[PDB]
């Protein structure tokens, strides 16, 4: 993968090129207002060392931070999300994989249309990387999910169990 981050809007200002995970952009970039993704799927992070608000970017050009749904121009670390050959996630009504369960292998823009629960209290990412969104149609707070067990919503870094949509991390 390759991403170019720019300090100012419309691909102007001081810039920095990443080919891999960077836990600390602070010495190189004082803010980020535009970005060009040549290749790979990237997660940008408000704070250093992959913490604070998260933003998913794919191949393409972002002329201002609003285009990746950024709330500010703070980008202090970034992750190249590894390629996955296949995608499967189980969502559960309750903590520790109890209650009603639904399994997805494809993107879902409205979770409540398939699974009549506003809150997801645990999930199992069996295959691939996903992005959980707080709201329907891929809006609100974003949480990157990599393969693993998530026995409660804190495990995916959320302050609540609100989930409205989710998407596979895929290029194409």
């Amino acid at each position: 993968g390759k991403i170019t981050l720019y300090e100012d809007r419309g691909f102007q200002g001081r810039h920095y090129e990443c080919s891999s995970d960077h836990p600390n952009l602070q010495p190189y970039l004082s803010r980020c207002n535009s970005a060009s993704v040549d290749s790979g799927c990237w997660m940008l992070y408000e704070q250093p060392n992959y913490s604070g608000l998260q933003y998913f970017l794919r191949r393409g050009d972002y002329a201002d931070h609003q285009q990746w749904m950024g709330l500010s121009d703070s980008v202090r670390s970034c992750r190249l999300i590894p390629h996955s050959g296949s995608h499967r996630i189980r969502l559960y009504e309750r903590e520790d994989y109890r209650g009603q369960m639904i399994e997805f292998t494809e993107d879902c823009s409205c979770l409540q249309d398939r699974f009549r629960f506003n809150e997801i209290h645990s999930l199992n990412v069996l295959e691939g990387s996903w992005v959980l969104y707080e709201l329907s149609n891929y809006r609100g707070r974003q949480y990157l999910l990599m393969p693993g067990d998530y026995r409660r919503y804190q495990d995916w870094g959320a302050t609540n169990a609100r989930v409205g949509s989710l998407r596979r991390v895929i290029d194409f």
Side-chain angles (χ1 to χ4, degrees), residues 1-171:
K2 197 175 113 173
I3 188 164
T4 314
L5 309 165
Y6 298 85
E7 289 201 333
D8 302 306
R9 280 201 334 286
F11 318 106
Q12 286 278 5
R14 185 163 141 248
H15 60 271
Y16 191 69
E17 200 163 285
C18 300
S19 305
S20 60
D21 297 352
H22 214 308
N24 189 15
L25 291 169
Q26 294 180 115
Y28 302 113
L29 215 68
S30 70
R31 54 184 195 276
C32 182
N33 277 287
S34 51
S36 287
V37 182
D38 174 75
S39 51
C41 298
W42 291 84
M43 214 72 188
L44 307 191
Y45 296 95
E46 180 184 35
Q47 301 180 336
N49 207 33
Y50 317 122
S51 63
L53 297 172
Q54 315 186 28
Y55 308 109
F56 177 59
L57 280 74
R58 283 195 284 214
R59 188 183 300 255
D61 298 290
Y62 304 79
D64 53 52
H65 69 72
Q66 284 88 354
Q67 289 185 22
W68 64 73
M69 314 217 70
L71 294 192
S72 72
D73 61 2
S74 186
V75 174
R76 291 200 185 94
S77 60
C78 66
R79 206 198 272 289
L80 183 57
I81 308 157
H83 177 260
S84 308
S86 76
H87 294 267
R88 185 180 303 281
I89 193 174
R90 291 171 174 160
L91 312 185
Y92 296 92
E93 168 191 11
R94 299 186 189 105
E95 322 222 319
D96 293 313
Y97 301 170
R98 282 153 163 71
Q100 274 181 65
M101 184 269 273
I102 191 163
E103 185 168 297
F104 296 112
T105 54
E106 304 208 324
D107 309 341
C108 184
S109 50
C110 188
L111 181 54
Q112 283 65 45
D113 260 346
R114 290 278 281 286
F115 194 61
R116 285 169 210 159
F117 294 102
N118 302 313
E119 309 178 34
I120 305 303
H121 281 279
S122 57
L123 57 89
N124 194 348
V125 186
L126 296 171
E127 300 160 48
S129 282
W130 297 74
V131 183
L132 244 51
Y133 297 80
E134 178 182 30
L135 300 177
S136 58
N137 291 309
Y138 310 126
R139 288 169 309 110
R141 278 167 173 248
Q142 306 183 26
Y143 316 98
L144 179 62
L145 300 178
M146 299 194 56
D149 301 301
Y150 302 78
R151 291 195 149 84
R152 47 192 199 106
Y153 67 78
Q154 289 79 356
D155 293 346
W156 63 83
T159 50
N160 59 70
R162 201 61 47 81
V163 182
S165 56
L166 62 154
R167 134 179 296 152
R168 299 166 291 152
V169 179
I170 290 177
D171 200 321

